[PDB]
Symmetry: C12
Subunit: 90 residues, 12 copies
């Protein structure tokens, strides 16, 4: 099964009314961060069980790497809100 090619979607941009673009991009960024959280957790549950049953240092090592990424992605969720607070500021 050859995967279906991606069809790109052009946004409508507003350089002289940027607030509406900023609103839209917040929604996009938020959506993506929720997606990442879901995907990382999904992978982690399986990677954990694989590592536990594998007596394989390699499996432990990649699980640790996954946790690292989960933490990084986690931290960015709160930073996003700080960034938005700053943007509404000056």
């Amino acid at each position: 099964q050859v995967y279906a090619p991606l069809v790109l979607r052009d946004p409508v941009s507003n350089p002289n009314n940027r607030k509406i673009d900023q609103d839209d991009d917040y929604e996009l960024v938020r959506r993506n961060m929720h997606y990442q959280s879901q995907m990382l957790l999904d992978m982690a549950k399986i990677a954990l069980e694989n590592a536990k049953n594998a007596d394989s240092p390699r499996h432990v090592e990649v699980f640790a790497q996954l946790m690292g990424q989960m933490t990084t992605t986690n931290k960015e969720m709160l930073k996003m809100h700080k960034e938005m607070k700053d943007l509404a500021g000056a």
Copy 2:
């Protein structure tokens, strides 16, 4: 395998009423951090006993690396409360 594919859940966002998004995202981040705590510990207990019985420098090395990640992840839980404190504040 073959594992059920992940079905993504699109959040509802509120760029002009962001406080409810912030509340929701705090709960999500906190949930995730608790999940990581549980997962890291579950892995660590098994990695430790495997390393102890392995007489294998590679096992000890990876265990040390796991401990490093556990520390890095654990540190962020209190950092998150500092972030939330600032988020409620002046900035």
Copy 3:
């Protein structure tokens, strides 16, 4: 394959009326960021399922790498708006 060769397209530039170029470049940058969001998500969905079923640390490792890039690229979106806020004016 053989893929059609890329034909490059020249913009019209205005060094002494730069605001119009700045407007156009914002639209280009934002478009590319949306394109990247779309492409990263498309890759991630497949990479995730491949990694889940691979029974392979290598697959998980590259998936984590992909997530790292997704986060990095993602965080640049609000940075762009901060940049535009500073820029104008």
Copy 4:
């Protein structure tokens, strides 16, 4: 060597009464730091005796690495308290 899957437990969070969450999270973090101390020491005692008896630079090298992590993880306990002091401020 066959393990039962991890059962995840959801915490209850309180975005508009965060202090009770902060209290609970301090207790979780401190617990985990104590766990890491215990696990690191447990590993170190065995890694030391293995390295002493192995006549193997590789064992010594990894024991040094372990001591490095022990120090790092150890340093974080007092940093936790400094963070909590700042949190209360």
Copy 5:
């Protein structure tokens, strides 16, 4: 696969009337940034489909690398405008 040698074209410079050079160089730089955007996107579209169909961590890894460069190169467009704003100052 046999290519004609590059013929280099000399610009005319004006050390004591540099503003006309600066104008021309802005146009060249902006053109090149637009070219890079087009080339990166062109490569990305194909690299994505190859990675999706390869079931290969190596393809995913390199696609991530490409996205990284796309973001970096993309970030530089607005930086160009900030630089030009400072130049005029």
Copy 6:
């Protein structure tokens, strides 16, 4: 081998009376530092003699690495006291 499995021990935490936890954590951290001092020296004495007799650059290399870690771990002891001085209060 098979080694007895580690049984983890939970501390009792006091988020609203943290000084008592801070006291206990200082004692734990100091104990671990003394333990590390003792273990590093124990390893070093054997690693030194092994390296002296090995006729092996690898042995000397890892011995130097061990000394580096010993110094790093060692220097943290007085840093701890500086940290405690800042902490209280």
Copy 7:
């Protein structure tokens, strides 16, 4: 090969009338930057089509690296004008 050896050209310098050296060196640097622009683009067009038709991660990887250098080199053109502006200024 065997390519004609390079014959080096010694400039005439003026430590006590440096402005003419500065003028000359600006022209040289600008010429070189334009040459690099031309060379990088000429390479990029071919590297791109080779990478597109190669189904080869190595080709994509090196193309990305080439793009990185192109960005780094391209950035210096405007930085050069800033440098020249400062050179005319107070400092």
Copy 8:
């Protein structure tokens, strides 16, 4: 000959009279630094002679590494005294 296992020794700590702990830990740190100096010099003398007689770049390289560590360990001896001076300060 299987080496005798290490028996760990618990210190007595005093969170509310820390000065006596600080005195004790200075003595421990000082002792260890003197130990390191002695061990590094002991290794270096042998590593030097081995390198001189080996026409082996590898031997020279590790001797250089040893000297690096000796210098680092050396520097920390004086820094220890500066640290102690600061601790008696405020």
Copy 9:
């Protein structure tokens, strides 16, 4: 053909009249930068054509490295003039 050995040339230095040394060293530095520019361009033209005709990622990669060095060497030409301006200053 064994290359002719380099015969080194000692400069005359003037620690108590350093301005004349500074003039001379500017001329030397300038000469070298012009030499580098010429050599880098000379190599680049050939490296470019080799890369174009080689369908070899390795050739592209080294050409990119060469361009990196050309840019670095380029930037230093202008920095040299800034350095000289500063030296005539205080």
Copy 10:
């Protein structure tokens, strides 16, 4: 080999009369720095002649590395006097 084992010497320390420890430790550090000077030079003379006669890039490479360490070690001798000067001072 088998070399005589090292017999460690425990110093007598004075946390409440630290000046005599400082005096002693200065003498020790200075002695060690002089020892390193002697050892580095002794090694360098032989490494140099070996490298000169080796027609071996590896020999030249390691010699360069040795020179690097010699510079780094040599620099610390005067840094030590600065440290001692500060130790006598206000801080």
Copy 11:
């Protein structure tokens, strides 16, 4: 080969009349810088022609490395004069 062994030469030092040593050391440093300029150029001319004729990426790679070192060593010449300006006095 066997090359004549190097005979080291001791300078005469003056800790309580350092200016004369500083003068001599400036002359030594400047001499070495001129020597390095001469040696780098000598190597570069041959390395360039070798690289041009080698049909070998490795040759070009090391040539670029050589150019990097030439630039680094070259830029230190005017830094030296800045250093001397600060030094005296």
Copy 12:
């Protein structure tokens, strides 16, 4: 190729009259810097001719490395004088 062991010579130190030690150590440091200059130049002259005649990128690469160390070591001579100037202050 058989060498006599190094005989270490103990200096006499004066913690409570440190200026005479400082004077002696300046002379030792300066001597060593002059020695390094001589050794580096001696090696460089031979490494250059070897690299010129080797038609070997490896020889060029290592010659560049040597020039790098020569510059670094060379830079330190004037830094020594700056340090001494600060010491007297």
